[PDB]
Symmetry: C2
Subunit: 51 residues, 2 copies
């Protein structure tokens, strides 16, 4: 009743891959990265805030 | 030399259909509209500024 409560859930409502492309294309000042390979061949791709 | 010049071109830089989906999905406070049918079925769709 002093600090606001949190009811975090795994919604996955943003699940669509095309939707993720939309949000990562028109994002603000961001530094989003992708891990897309297994640990023996893993990598991270870091791109522009909004491109 | 006083009024700025204009060199507008047909860019089609957002030619990809998903690119237009991104710009109409991540748009600001807009009123973007779509006409998607011919004169005998012509209409217009108006939707939320960013949804």
């Amino acid at each position: 009743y002093t600090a606001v409560a949190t009811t975090a859930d795994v919604l996955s409502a943003m699940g669509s891959s095309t939707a993720v492309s939309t949000v990562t294309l028109g994002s603000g000042i961001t530094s989003a990265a992708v891990t897309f390979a297994i640990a023996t061949t893993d990598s991270n791709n870091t791109w522009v805030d909004n491109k």
